[PDB]
């Protein structure tokens, strides 16, 4: 289906514990493929998926210096934003940045993004037109004007509609055999009595990729939206994901509940009944 490439940057000041820490990770869909950690020993951008390794050494040279450049800029921004907000140097603060591009099932540009947070809250973000900005508060407006003055949006728009989609398409092709796979969920049900009159039914989705999935419980065909415990989709550790939905039912009435599993690797959605 559709596809995305996304980079996530985190810069954390740690007064009294050294210089700021910078961590960058790059994803294609739900697959991480690069990593940069300022505390790590290599001081290099590193592969994290087998297919990115077929880039030549000039790739890793160029990636390493651009990532390093962003952390450098983040260090400046940690000091600057502290000014905007009149915060003392004794405090830890965090700048986060996420950007990337989406392509359709045919590799065509769909959307570009770039958003920045400070201390976990929206700071400034690029609008969908990829030419205007939206400042979250008063301090970010100072940045907005700085970035209007420097035509940052046009640098950013040229990247998002240019290199970003180009290398996203490229990575999709070179990693076709894992990135364009779908592993459908392996499903099963568990069942445990809680009392003499109630029991838990738990509906399991294991080993699936991509992470997007929907599990819904129904009773006699009616969504049980409110009474279901649903956990966040979680990584198995091997590139796939897991999720479950559970519901407490009257003991003896299990046959009225159905678990419905929708995932793009499933030709048709699954229905499970105890």
């Amino acid at each position: 289906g559709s596809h995305s490439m996304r980079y996530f940057y985190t810069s954390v000041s740690r007064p009294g514990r050294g210089e700021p820490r910078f961590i960058a990770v790059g994803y294609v869909d739900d697959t991480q493929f690069v990593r940069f950690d300022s505390d790590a020993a290599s001081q290099r951008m590193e592969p994290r998926a087998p297919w990115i390794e077929q880039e030549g050494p000039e790739y890793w040279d160029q990636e390493t210096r651009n990532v390093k450049a962003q952390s450098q800029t983040d260090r400046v921004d940690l000091g600057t934003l502290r000014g905007y907000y009149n915060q003392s140097e004794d405090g830890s603060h965090t700048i986060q940045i996420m950007y990337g591009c989406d392509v359709g099932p045919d590799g065509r540009f769909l959307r570009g993004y770039r958003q920045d947070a400070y201390d976990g809250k929206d700071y400034i973000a690029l609008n969908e037109d990829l030419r205007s900005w939206t400042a979250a508060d008063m301090a970010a407006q100072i940045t907005k004007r700085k970035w209007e003055a420097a035509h940052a949006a046009e640098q950013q728009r040229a990247y998002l509609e240019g290199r970003c989609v180009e290398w996203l398409r490229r990575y999709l092709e070179n990693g076709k055999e894992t990135l364009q796979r779908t592993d459908p969920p392996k499903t099963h049900m568990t069942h445990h009595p809680i009392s003499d009159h109630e029991a838990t039914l738990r509906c399991w989705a294991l080993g699936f990729y991509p992470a997007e999935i929907t599990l819904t419980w129904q009773r006699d065909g009616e969504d049980q939206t409110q009474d279901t415990e649903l956990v966040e989709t979680r990584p198995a550790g091997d590139g796939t994901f897991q999720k479950w939905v559970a519901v407490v039912v009257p003991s003896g009435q299990e046959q009225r509940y159905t678990c419905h599993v929708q995932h793009e690797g499933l030709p048709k959605p699954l229905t499970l009944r105890w």
């Binding site: 790059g26 651009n66 990532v67 450049a69 400046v76 950007y99 400034i124 700085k146 990247y159 970003c164």
Partner: peptide, 9 residues
Amino acid sequence: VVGAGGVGK
């Protein structure tokens, strides 16, 4: 591939 030199906040 990552983006190039950002401006500065």
